[PDB]
Amino acid sequence: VAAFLKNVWAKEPVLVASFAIAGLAVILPTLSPYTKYSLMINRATPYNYPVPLRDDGNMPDVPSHPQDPQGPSLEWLKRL
Amino acid sequence: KQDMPPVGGYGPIDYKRNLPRRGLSGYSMFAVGIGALLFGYWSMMKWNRERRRLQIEDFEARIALMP
User: Does the beta carbon of A64 lie under 8 angstroms from any beta carbon of chain B?
Assistant: First the structure.
């Protein structure tokens, strides 16, 4: 079966190259950590309006000032 | 007395059949193909991600106004 890759690649060299692109395409999205950066950006794109809520006692976090360090940090991308 | 056949001066031209001007064969090809292909993918992620940065910038002006 070791020459089976060398008696068809010298016989029909078209679909042999297709199966190699069938390979190396399913496997790699589960491999490199550049994915889940695809997920963090695609969720952090603001379409709609972020409506604020009503305070009653608490206040667990996030006061009215927008430029305060009160929310998350997606600002790694601008530094990236 | 004025007939043809000359004393000398002959070639001939060849009956040969050859022009093997190769040509960067034998695994030297497929090497300039793959590296330049990933070079085009390397040109990505510095433009699409850059335009993605401007894309949030574009949507930023929409959300800041409209109260």
Answer: no
